[PDB]
Amino acid sequence: NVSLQPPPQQLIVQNKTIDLPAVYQLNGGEEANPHAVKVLKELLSGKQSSKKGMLISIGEKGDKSVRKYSRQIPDHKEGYYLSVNEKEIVLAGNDERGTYYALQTFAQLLKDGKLPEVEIKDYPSVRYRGVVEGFYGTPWSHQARLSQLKFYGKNKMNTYIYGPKDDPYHSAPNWRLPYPDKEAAQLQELVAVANENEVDFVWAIHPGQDWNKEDRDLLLAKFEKMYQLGVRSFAVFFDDISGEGTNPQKQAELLNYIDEKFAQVKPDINQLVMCPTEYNKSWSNPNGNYLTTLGDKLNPSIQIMWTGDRVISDITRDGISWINERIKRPAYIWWNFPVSDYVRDHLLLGPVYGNDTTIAKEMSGFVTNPMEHAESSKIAIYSVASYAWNPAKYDTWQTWKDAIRTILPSAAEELECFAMHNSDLGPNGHGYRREESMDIQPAAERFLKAFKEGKNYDKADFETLQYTFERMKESADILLMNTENKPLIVEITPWVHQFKLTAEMGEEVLKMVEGRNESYFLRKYNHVKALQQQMFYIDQTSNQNPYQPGVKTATRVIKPLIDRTFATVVKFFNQKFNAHLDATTDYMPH
Numbered sequence: 001n002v003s004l005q006p007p008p009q010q011l012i013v014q015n016k017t018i019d020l021p022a023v024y025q026l027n028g029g030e031e032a033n034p035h036a037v038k039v040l041k042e043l044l045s046g047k048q049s050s051k052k053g054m055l056i057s058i059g060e061k062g063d064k065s066v067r068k069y070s071r072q073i074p075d076h077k078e079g080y081y082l083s084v085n086e087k088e089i090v091l092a093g094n095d096e097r098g099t100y101y102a103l104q105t106f107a108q109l110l111k112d113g114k115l116p117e118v119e120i121k122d123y124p125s126v127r128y129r130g131v132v133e134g135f136y137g138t139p140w141s142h143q144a145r146l147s148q149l150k151f152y153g154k155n156k157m158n159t160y161i162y163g164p165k166d167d168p169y170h171s172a173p174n175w176r177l178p179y180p181d182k183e184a185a186q187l188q189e190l191v192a193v194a195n196e197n198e199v200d201f202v203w204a205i206h207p208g209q210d211w212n213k214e215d216r217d218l219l220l221a222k223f224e225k226m227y228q229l230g231v232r233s234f235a236v237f238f239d240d241i242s243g244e245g246t247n248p249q250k251q252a253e254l255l256n257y258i259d260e261k262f263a264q265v266k267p268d269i270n271q272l273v274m275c276p277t278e279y280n281k282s283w284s285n286p287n288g289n290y291l292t293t294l295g296d297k298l299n300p301s302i303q304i305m306w307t308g309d310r311v312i313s314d315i316t317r318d319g320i321s322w323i324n325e326r327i328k329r330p331a332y333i334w335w336n337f338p339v340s341d342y343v344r345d346h347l348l349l350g351p352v353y354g355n356d357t358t359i360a361k362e363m364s365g366f367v368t369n370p371m372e373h374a375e376s377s378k379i380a381i382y383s384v385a386s387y388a389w390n391p392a393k394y395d396t397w398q399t400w401k402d403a404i405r406t407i408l409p410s411a412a413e414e415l416e417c418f419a420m421h422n423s424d425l426g427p428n429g430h431g432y433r434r435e436e437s438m439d440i441q442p443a444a445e446r447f448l449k450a451f452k453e454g455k456n457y458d459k460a461d462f463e464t465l466q467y468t469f470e471r472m473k474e475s476a477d478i479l480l481m482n483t484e485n486k487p488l489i490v491e492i493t494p495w496v497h498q499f500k501l502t503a504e505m506g507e508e509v510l511k512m513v514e515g516r517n518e519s520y521f522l523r524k525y526n527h528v529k530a531l532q533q534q535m536f537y538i539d540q541t542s543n544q545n546p547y548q549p550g551v552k553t554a555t556r557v558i559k560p561l562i563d564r565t566f567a568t569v570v571k572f573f574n575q576k577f578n579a580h581l582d583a584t585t586d587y588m589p590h
């Protein structure tokens with residue numbers, strides 16, 4: 001059955017299916033977007049017959065090939081019309097990017113050499129959609145970035161804001177310097193791949209550290225050299241700046257200057273974006289001037305980034321009106337999820353939710369700040385893509401499952417299990433939390449409650465927990481050895497080990513609850529203690545960083561259930577046999 005991510009604006013399925021044609025005639029192969037034609041030719045290995053076979057027509061509005069279907073093509077940037085029936089196939093973009101988007105949709109329809117009969121009219125609700133490379137921690141590799149960009153094109157994200165922290169040429173002081181040949185050629189390769197995948201490579205300059213005519217000049221000259229390298233989209237960051245540099249009139253002046261002498265002078269600049277000094281409502285001064293002045297003086301064609309009501313927050317109608325009213329334009333949203341650079345011992349693999357689905361007209365852009373774990377971030381990235389394309393049809397849970405099935409088809413259920421219990425951030429200085437382990441929350445609560453007050457627990461809840469731990473160990477072991485996405489596995493390995501140990505500990509603790517005799521109980525107790533020690537070992541030796549070192553997993557519901565069940569059963573044991581076992585859950589070498 002027809003599943004499409006992102007879901008099209010309009011879709012009609014006929015409940016018939018046609019074969020991908022053995023023999024086809026291609027119309028418009030020459031005048032249509034070469035990137036789209038390339039995908040189409042990839043999917044086709046029947047024979048191009050010049051006078052026979054099923055017509056396939058590909059083109060942008062105004063091409064000869066799609067003249068007949070012009071009224072069906074949506075009048076929206078990046079829009080397209082796609083049609084499949086017995087007679088013919090139509091892939092008609094409103095523009096070149098739209099034709100490519102058609103083809104991305106077409107590739108998802110094609111299953112086992114068969115196509116549904118369908119008619120689609122489609123376009124994005126939000127103008128700019130993608131990823132800002134905006135996390136602290138170990139930068140992504142070159143290969144990681146190439147793989148991201150291909151994923152962005154598949155999910156119709158048109159925006160990549162480049163900024164690896166190990167590249168000094170977009171930061172102080174080296175922003176003034178041209179890229180040396182080797183680095184330039186690498187960035188060049190990113191640009192080429194971004195272009196092939198219809199993604200805007202947005203080169204971000206971060207000069208905030210370092211206001212005269214000559215600084216203005218050097219920036220403009222640098223922008224020019226990045227143009228020669230093939231860059232067509234640009235961002236200027238002021239999150240960074242202090243003192244005089246925080247003056248919004250002077251920020252506007254430089255940006256309006258860049259617009260006039262560079263962006264308006266070139267034939268083909270797409271995005272010009274700035275990040276303001278006050279970038280969320282919490283960190284702005286209600287008693288000050290900065291956002292209204294920016295909104296007044298900054299040219300209308302320049303985007304202003306915004307994180308919402310707080311630095312980590314989900315965007316609401318009230319939030320978006322607050323900012324738009326000040327900047328006098330639709331805010332370009334920077335969403336600080338799934339970035340984990342302030343909770344580095346946690347993976348954030350849960351669904352994308354919380355953003356208001358009715359406000360697409362009030363946002364110019366929506367970009368996600370991801371984790372230092374590139375592959376792992378694809379779960380949220382795919383979901384963001386889906387949300388930003390079609391927010392009205394956004395389905396958090398189905399999109400989450402679809403992302404997981406896309407990223408790891410050979411072990412989707414196992415990754416779902418792992419991801420379900422690795423979602424929450426735990427307590428943190430931003431107060432931002434996510435749900436986790438919702439499937440077993442009721443079983444866990446009722447189990448604890450009963451076990452607490454020396455009332456009997458339900459056998460079914462015991463079994464649910466038992467089943468959960470068994471499933472976690474199966475999932476951990478299958479994921480560790482999975483070779484379909486080795487980079488993914490490499491990223492999560494430390495947590496997978498910790499997650500397996502958590503499950504083993506849970507099983508041992510359940511055996512203490514059933515405790516048949518004193519000797520068996522003591523065996524399980526000693527095993528639990530040794531497993532706690534291994535978890536500390538991993539916590540002390542993996543993922544070491546100055547900020548949140550180590551590895552935490554299943555922290556919201558599962559680990560606390562195990563900890564409390566352990567402390568309770570040990571206290572019961574101590575009372576019964578008049579013993580003095582340590583009931584604590586965090587072992588300690590001192």
Ligand SMILES: CC1CCN(c2ccnc(NCCc3ccccc3)n2)CC1
Binds near residue numbers: 239279
């Ligand atoms: C638009 C702005 C740009 C700068 N921001 C970054 C940059 C990198 N990482 C993150 N991680 C989020 C937690 C956090 C960390 C440091 C400072 C504040 C909030 N935020 C905040 C958003």
